[PDB]
Design a protein around this nucleic acid. Structure first.
Length: 49
DNA sequence: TAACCGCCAAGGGGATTACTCCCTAGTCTCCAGGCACGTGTTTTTTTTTTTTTTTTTTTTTTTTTTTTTCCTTTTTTTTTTTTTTTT
């Protein structure tokens, strides 16, 4: 029952999470930006690694 | 049974006369509360914007793959041809 029930909302959460960050991009200056170019992080993971 | 009347006796105080005196009527003269006029500052009414809960709407529901079965109209009204009866 626990295997059958929660896996619908698990896949829905995975699809929602992959749709929200589908264009969060590391650029050539080391910064992290989305599709519109808004700055999210100056370095990826706050260390650029 | 004592109201009432008649008779008699006694006394108490209101009316009268005179003297006084003192308080108010009258008349100036100054001035101040009583009153006519204007208005107020609270009270009610009305708007105004928000608040808070209720109700309604809308959108969503892991992915991939392989087999069958049933259905993919249907009754209901209108039209048009055919057949039978009559003069």
């Amino acid at each position: 029952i626990d295997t059958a029930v929660k896996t619908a909302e698990t896949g829905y959460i995975q699809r929602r999470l992959i749709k929200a960050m589908e264009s969060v991009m590391v650029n050539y200056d080391g910064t992290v930006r989305n599709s519109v170019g808004q700055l999210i992080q100056l370095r990826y993971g706050e260390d650029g690694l």
